[PDB]
Design a protein around this ligand. Structure first.
Ligand SMILES: CCCCN(CCCC)C(=O)c1cc(C)n(-c2ccccc2C(=O)N2Cc3ccccc3C[C@H]2CN)n1
Length: 148
């Protein structure tokens, strides 16, 4: 389910910062692989997230517009797994930031916007491209390459 993968992902990100989410908490290997891929994405692009956040100026009034803007740029050159990982980690980072700015009402909204975008705009692609199992396979190949 699209709701479930978003929910597990967001739950994990918030739990990483000690935040337990009222509405929170696909194979287990899929969730685990997406968790690691997102964590590596954040490690590499930490500085970029910090700069982008500053540009977006998160508020309840502008959160949806910022979410839509980011996602439109992310997928401007089409969908691939790497960009889907970016998507998840962007939604995660935005949920952590919401909580940090005493805007925790946004977490539920961001999770809904993520699940909707998955449903309306990534679902076809995912299925055409072998589903979440293909993501796991890709991750494996890349891990073996990065090892050697
Ligand atoms: C995490 C989603 C960032 C999407 N974005 C910012 C939109 C601001 C309105 C992008 O410009 C964007 C577009 C693409 C294809 N991507 C990437 C996808 C995979 C790997 C890197 C990028 C990328 O282009 N960047 C990574 C990143 C991460 C966090 C914050 C901003 C950016 C932008 C660039 C930085 N070099 N990021």
């Amino acid at each position: 389910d699209n709701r479930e993968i978003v929910m597990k992902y967001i739950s994990y990100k918030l739990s990483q910062r000690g935040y337990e989410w009222d509405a929170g908490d696909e194979s287990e290997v899929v969730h685990q692989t997406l968790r690691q891929a997102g964590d590596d994405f954040s490690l590499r692009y930490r500085r970029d997230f910090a700069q982008m956040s500053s540009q977006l100026h998160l508020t309840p009034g502008t959160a949806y517009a910022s979410f839509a803007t980011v996602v439109a740029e992310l997928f401007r050159d089409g969908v691939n797994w790497g960009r889907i990982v970016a998507f998840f980690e962007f939604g995660g980072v935005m949920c952590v930031e919401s909580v940090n700015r005493a805007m925790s009402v946004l977490v539920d909204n961001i999770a809904a916007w993520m699940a909707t975008y998955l449903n309306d705009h990534l679902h076809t692609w995912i299925q055409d491209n072998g589903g979440w199992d293909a993501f796991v396979e890709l991750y494996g190949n890349n891990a073996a390459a990065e090892s050697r």
